[PDB]
Design a protein around this ligand. Structure first.
Ligand SMILES: O=P(O)(O)C(O)(C[n+]1cccc(F)c1)P(=O)(O)O
Ligand SMILES: O=P(O)(O)C(O)(C[n+]1cccc(F)c1)P(=O)(O)O
Ligand SMILES: [Mg+2]
Ligand SMILES: [Mg+2]
Ligand SMILES: [Mg+2]
Ligand SMILES: [Mg+2]
Ligand SMILES: [Mg+2]
Ligand SMILES: [Mg+2]
Lengths: 362, 362
């Protein structure tokens, strides 16, 4: 796609500025500059760029239906790219830490950043922190004169906070709430009482929906200066729904999608994560099925993992997924329909975003 | 001290707001709210609060020499406390990650946060991230109406970035620059060619001086609205000097100060850190001394650590420290003298900050 290459060109423009600043104002040596360049490329590139490209196509939508000088058209497009990358970089930040947390071995077909021989966990933690720091630097540089600044930084902060809170919920999802004690080591849940749709929804919302759909959609609105034209309660509502779906997809892909296609090696079962599959299974399984699940979940043992994957297949889970997908298509159509009232151009943007998500394989 | 208890009361006011927001807008359950409260208390409290109390006494300085209503006097003091805590929280953030990175066992007399049985490294990484996130939340809440907002956030971002960059330099200080390769595992330096005053100064500057002296001093100036009265080039110059000293202190304390007094268990030697002691030793040691240092540095082996501590003691390092301290007192007096020209009230503030630092034991 031609549009994806134009977005990727602003990355090179962003990377060159970021590395020159390091050299000119932070006294970095060539080899450490090289290291961070490699770190940037590995962590930030290789993905679908769904999040970056959403802020671009929300922005383009308005550009087709708005009178602007050629120069303004150009600057809004450029703004959409920097906004895109900020998000991309913000995700990169979260991925790096997520991988050390979930103990993953592979991201986007290459090894996980911390698993690079010359990196190790002790560098990666800081590398991630720099990735987040970058988002703010490229904000204060590029958007220094822009009206939408205070508002962009405020949303960024808040979206970021939700993500950290969501991450906290997720990494402690295999614990019993009432047992949580910083002084006593945490045992897995034996009863799985916190594997409810409710508690799962709560997790997904904060860890996924804010940075994945809310942020790019509203960021496209900011760069366009079109926040006022749409009803923000709908955007929050649509973003949390497509966001929920996007994470449900990610969960099934973890178990049933081959790594070569996925680019990721599954880790949920071995980590006893409160995934949609675990929750949905427990949502329909019988007494014998449940007991066998309890005796097998949360182990790195290839046999116990296989017993669970068989338990999922037998429970006919891809039937439950198609019934969930059917109900989401309804509610997304609904909300897109609602969005036409005030902003037809943003309503289609959401129709396109939903389409690309509802279609993904990796 | 009475002033330290008043600052600590705003912490309780900050913590209560932060935890109520979680409950009201982020759907947190009592036990997870309890967890973060404990996490906040352990990471943020227990320290000297040098950084928080500096923004307070810079602010008070101006208040004694400026006409203000009782209400304004009160609001500026309150602002100084929130500014103080932001910094305290920003440090807390860095400490948590620093401890996993340096592999430390003890912070402020208690175990390192990640070493709490009920925490583990996988939670701690995110906990740290939340600590940083908090600083921004309490910024956007408390300083939403304040003129100094854009300027405070901009400095915070930049100071934060330097710290991450400084951290990057520090964790890779036992490597050879030219060998750094994300694909090849990193061997210790055998030649120690990057153990120069220059390279050490470069490290300390970015990892310590920005968040420890620059940030609180200028933050006190912002809350007072007094940035214009002082010359910023002097503040940057004085903060990087006292900051250098503060880190030099931290290095000697690592080796020669007993943990019971320090609250920390030393880790530099075992990690082959580019510390002031290592650099200063190599700066005066002979051929036989150097070779023995090379064959012993960077090991967790109690015997090899002891051989190094003896090498430091023999090289009469506390003579070199007193000559460095003497030269810093000169240059700090100098800069304080320079600061009297435009701002006598801030000049004393720096005279007091230097005094407390030059006096510390822990
Ligand atoms: O399966 P992955 O690693 O793609 C994941 O969705 C990433 N991720 C998603 C949301 C927040 C985050 F920090 C990280 P998860 O959390 O491991 O499921
Ligand atoms: O000895 P410590 O742990 O007090 C240290 O100064 C902390 N610290 C200082 C600066 C930045 C940072 F992230 C952390 P160091 O780095 O381990 O020497
Ligand atoms: Mg995760
Ligand atoms: Mg993961
Ligand atoms: Mg997953
Ligand atoms: Mg360190
Ligand atoms: Mg340390
Ligand atoms: Mg130290």
């Amino acid at each position: 796609m031609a549009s994806m290459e134009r977005f990727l060109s602003v990355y090179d423009e962003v990377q060159a500025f970021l590395l020159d600043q390091l050299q000119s104002k932070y006294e970095i040596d060539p080899n450490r500059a090289r290291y961070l360049r490699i770190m940037m490329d590995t962590t930030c590139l290789g993905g679908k760029y769904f999040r970056g490209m959403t802020v671009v196509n929300v922005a383009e939508g308005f550009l087709a239906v708005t009178q602007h000088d050629e120069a303004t058209k150009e600057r809004i497009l450029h703004d959409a790219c920097v906004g895109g990358w900020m998000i991309e970089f913000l995700q990169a930040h979260y991925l790096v830490e997520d991988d050390i947390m979930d103990g993953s071995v592979m991201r986007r077909g290459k090894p996980c950043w911390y698993r690079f021989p010359g990196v190790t966990t002790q560098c990666a933690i800081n590398d991630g922190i720099i990735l987040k720091s970058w988002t703010q630097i490229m904000a204060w540089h590029y958007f220094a004169d822009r009206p939408f600044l205070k508002d962009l930084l405020c949303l960024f902060q808040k979206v970021d906070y939700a993500t950290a809170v969501g991450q906290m919920y997720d990494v402690t999802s295999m614990c019993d709430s009432n047992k949580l004690d910083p002084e006593v080591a945490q045992p897995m849940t034996t009863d799985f009482a916190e594997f409810t749709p409710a508690i799962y929804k709560r997790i997904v919302k904060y860890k996924t929906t804010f940075y994945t759909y809310l942020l790019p959609l509203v960021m496209g609105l900011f760069v366009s200066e079109a926040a006022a034209s749409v009803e923000m309660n709908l955007v929050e509502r649509v973003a949390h729904l497509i966001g929920e779906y996007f994470q449900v997809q990610d969960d099934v892909m973890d178990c049933f999608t081959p790594p070569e296609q996925l680019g990721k090696v599954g880790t949920d079962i071995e980590d006893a994560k409160c995934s949609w599959l675990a929750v949905t299974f427990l949502g329909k399984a019988n007494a014998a099925q449940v007991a066998e699940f309890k005796a097998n979940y949360g182990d790195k043992d290839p046999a116990k993992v296989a017993v669970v994957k068989r338990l999922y297949s037998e429970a006919n889970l891809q039937a439950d997924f198609a019934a969930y997908e059917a109900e989401v298509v309804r509610e997304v159509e609904s909300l897109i329909e609602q969005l036409k009232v005030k902003s037809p151009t943003f309503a289609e943007s959401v129709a396109v975003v939903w389409e690309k998500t509802h279609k993904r394989k990796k």
